[PDB]
């Protein structure tokens, strides 16, 4: 469910927040996302 605050457990990464589509350029090996503050920003869907 996108565009709705929701607790997520993506591949064992527990948290809460709003998910949506992105136009990122994830390289094939890339799995996670972060920022200069080192906090999980984008998580690739295991099943999509």
């Amino acid at each position: 469910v996108k565009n709705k605050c929701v607790n997520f457990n993506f591949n064992g990464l527990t948290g809460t927040g709003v998910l949506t589509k992105s136009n990122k350029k994830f390289l094939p090996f890339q799995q996670f996302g972060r920022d200069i503050v080192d906090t999980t920003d984008a998580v690739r869907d295991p099943q999509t």
């Binding site: 990122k24 350029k25 390289l27 890339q30 996302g33």
Partner: peptide
């Protein structure tokens, strides 16, 4: 056979330490 000449590597041999997308 083979030779063992020495050269310089310059800026080379840098790999993604992990699999976390990062930008800017």
């Amino acid at each position: 056979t083979t030779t063992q000449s020495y050269t310089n590597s310059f800026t080379r041999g840098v790999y993604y330490p992990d699999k976390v997308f990062r930008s800017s």
